[PDB]
Scaffold this active site. Structure first.
Site, PDB file in Angstrom:
ATOM      1  N   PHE A  27       0.800  -1.238   0.000  1.00 26.98           N
ATOM      2  CA  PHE A  27       0.000   0.000   0.000  1.00 26.98           C
ATOM      3  C   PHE A  27       0.826   1.279   0.000  1.00 26.98           C
ATOM      4  O   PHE A  27       0.321   2.340   0.348  1.00 26.98           O
ATOM      5  CB  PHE A  27      -0.963  -0.007   1.191  1.00 26.98           C
ATOM      6  N   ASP A 141       9.061  -1.040  14.634  1.00 26.03           N
ATOM      7  CA  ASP A 141       9.383  -1.638  13.341  1.00 26.03           C
ATOM      8  C   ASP A 141      10.829  -1.315  12.980  1.00 26.03           C
ATOM      9  O   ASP A 141      11.152  -1.148  11.815  1.00 26.03           O
ATOM     10  CB  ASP A 141       8.418  -1.093  12.274  1.00 26.03           C
TER      11      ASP A 141
END
Ligand SMILES: Cc1cnc(Nc2ccc(CC#N)cc2)nc1Nc1cc(C2CC2)[nH]n1
Ligand SMILES: [Cl-]
Length: 278
Positions: A27, A141
């Site tokens: 995305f 992350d």
């Protein structure tokens, strides 16, 4: 839906995209662009608002907020501008021309990365993560693919990127802390686990937890089965090893903070060009 950020017509009036695509995920795509006025390079990150059914503009607004909150930290990638069209919100981000620190972890590019550089890169990563944790932001992350370099010939400074997983206090398996595998709440300690992995990868040029299959990866993380054999560590100093072994511990509460980590003896170094005062 009505658009919030600057129009696409303005984007194409002010910038030209180049043929260097920098990254692509499900995305999101990142491409280099150039200001038509100044010639300065940027990274344009194009984020889809609609994902898996879900209107995600709110989530994108959250990431923009976090980047804005960290504007004053030179260790975090700068957000310069934002544009929006029917399907995308576009982030105009500081260009890190050195690419990913992950590149320095591959056996390919590893006789050109001294001990001094690892110590400096880890120090800089910890300063940025300290700043984030002081602000109650846990990145969540921090894989080496998400820490960039301002340059590699010569080695420049680190820029932390991709705050899409950011929160207040199921990705790529090998980078997941054990508390994530056990669903525990988010802790600043999770970023510290990931700093252990980056040190391990810069220094050994191997992944600490990846297995033949995800099943083995997950068991490696949950058992904290890390290779510290003399073969892998014959050219890594004890102090570096101590640094890693203090971060790669199962219990998040027993990991040191970023603050404590910055005082670690491994990272205490005098720059020999400077006159030391006893
Ligand atoms: C030469 C270069 C090479 N590789 C990457 N990798 C990469 C890694 C993570 C993300 C995830 C995100 N965002 C995007 C690209 N970025 C580069 N320059 C960038 C990339 C950027 C901003 C972060 C995009 N500025 N300069
Ligand atoms: Cl980003």
């Amino acid at each position: 839906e009505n658009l919030y950020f600057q129009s696409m017509e303005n984007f194409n009036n002010f910038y030209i995209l180049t043929s260097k695509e920098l990254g692509r995920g499900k995305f999101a795509v990142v491409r280099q662009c150039i200001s038509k006025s100044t010639g300065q390079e940027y990274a344009a990150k194009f984020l889809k608002k609609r994902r898996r059914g879900q209107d995600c503009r709110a989530e994108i607004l959250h990431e923009i907020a976090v980047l804005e909150l960290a504007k004053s930290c030179p260790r975090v990638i700068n957000l310069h501008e934002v544009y929006e069209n029917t399907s995308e919100i576009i982030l105009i981000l500081e260009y890190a021309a050195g690419g990913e620190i992950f590149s320095l972890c591959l056996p390919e590019l590893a006789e050109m990365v001294s001990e001094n550089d690892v110590i400096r890169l880890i120090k800089q990563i910890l300063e940025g993560v300290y700043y984030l944790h002081q602000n109650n932001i846990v990145h969540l992350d921090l894989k080496p693919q998400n820490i960039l370099l301002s340059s590699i010939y010569p080695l420049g400074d680190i820029k932390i990127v991709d705050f899409g997983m950011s929160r207040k206090i199921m990705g790529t398996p090998e980078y997941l802390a054990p508390e994530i595998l056990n669903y525990d709440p988010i802790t600043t300690a999770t970023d510290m686990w990931n700093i252990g992995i980056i040190a391990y990868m810069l220094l050994t040029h191997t992944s600490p937890f990846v297995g033949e299959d995800n099943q083995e990866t997950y068991l490696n993380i949950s058992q904290v089965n890390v290779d510290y054999s003399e073969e892998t560590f014959s050219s890594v100093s004890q102090l570096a090893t101590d640094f890693i072994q203090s971060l790669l511990v199962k219990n998040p509460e027993k990991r040191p903070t970023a603050e404590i980590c910055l005082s670690h003896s491994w990272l205490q170094q005098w720059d020999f060009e400077n006159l030391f005062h006893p």
